[PDB]
């Protein structure tokens, strides 16, 4: 499932950072300032994951049996499960990303067919 593998390997991206940060925080040769900066990053990442979660939720809320949001970067990538797709649909989606985010540079919605 082109969608579902999109999800799975975004979660690997995320599982590998989670892992790399923890590598530092449990190491001897990292200073307690260095160890904290790592923690800070884990925290920030989790915040990101919780907003992605809300946007997917709000998005599935108008049709869309599934949604996948990557808000990490400057450009926010959105993947949705849809056979139908239009300039109309995209705006409805973009519209509500704007309303939950300023700081927002570009948005890219992909409607992936089942």
């Amino acid at each position: 499932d082109l969608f579902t593998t999109y999800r799975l390997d975004l979660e690997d991206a995320r599982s590998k950072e989670r892992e790399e940060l923890n590598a530092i925080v449990s190491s001897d040769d990292a200073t307690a300032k260095e160890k904290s900066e790592a923690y800070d990053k884990m925290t920030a990442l989790s915040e990101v994951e919780g907003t992605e979660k809300q946007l997917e939720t709000l998005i599935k809320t108008q049709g869309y049996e599934d949604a996948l949001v990557n808000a990490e970067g400057d450009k926010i990538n959105i993947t949705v499960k849809s056979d139908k797709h239009s300039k109309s649909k995209a705006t409805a989606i973009i519209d509500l990303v704007a309303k939950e985010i300023k700081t927002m540079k570009d948005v890219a919605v992909t409607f992936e067919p089942s």
């Binding site: 300039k87 705006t91 973009i94 890219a108």
Partner: protein, 143 residues
């Protein structure tokens, strides 16, 4: 003093605007750029001749060229840096008249208009952007 980046400024019209949320929908819809199944925001404006046809792409206000090249997605792209964080961008070119490092003067021609993945219809067009410290702004607010 921001130059419309087209030598012949008649017959060349803006076919796509800079996407503004908090703007009428359907003009938002006309500010989307798209390829295959995916839609994105227009970060600049798109210029083009009625009927479609190529044409020369003049620099907007002058300065040094930071980038010139083909991008598989964007066609031919040139970037020109300017004073205090400003830069302009020209994409979907069919070719380029300069190389990185070239000093350029406003209204100095560069490559003609072209196509890239985002072309809808039969092309061609130029994509133009203005950026303050890398952030894109509505180029029409400078014209």
């Amino acid at each position: 003093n921001v130059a419309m980046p087209v030598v012949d400024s008649e017959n060349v019209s803006v076919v796509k605007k800079f996407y503004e949320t908090d703007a009428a929908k359907e003009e938002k819809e006309a500010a989307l750029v798209t390829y295959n199944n995916t839609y994105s925001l227009s970060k600049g404006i798109d210029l083009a001749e009625k009927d479609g046809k190529d044409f020369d792409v003049s620099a907007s206000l002058s300065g040094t060229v930071v980038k010139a090249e083909k991008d598989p997605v964007l066609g031919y792209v040139v970037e020109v840096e300017h004073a205090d964080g400003l830069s302009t961008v020209y994409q979907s070119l069919s070719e380029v008249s300069v190389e990185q490092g070239d000093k350029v003067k406003q209204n100095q021609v560069i490559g003609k208009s072209g196509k890239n993945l985002y072309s809808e219809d039969s092309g061609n067009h130029v994509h133009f952007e203005i950026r303050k410290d890398g952030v894109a702004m509505n180029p029409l607010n400078f014209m």
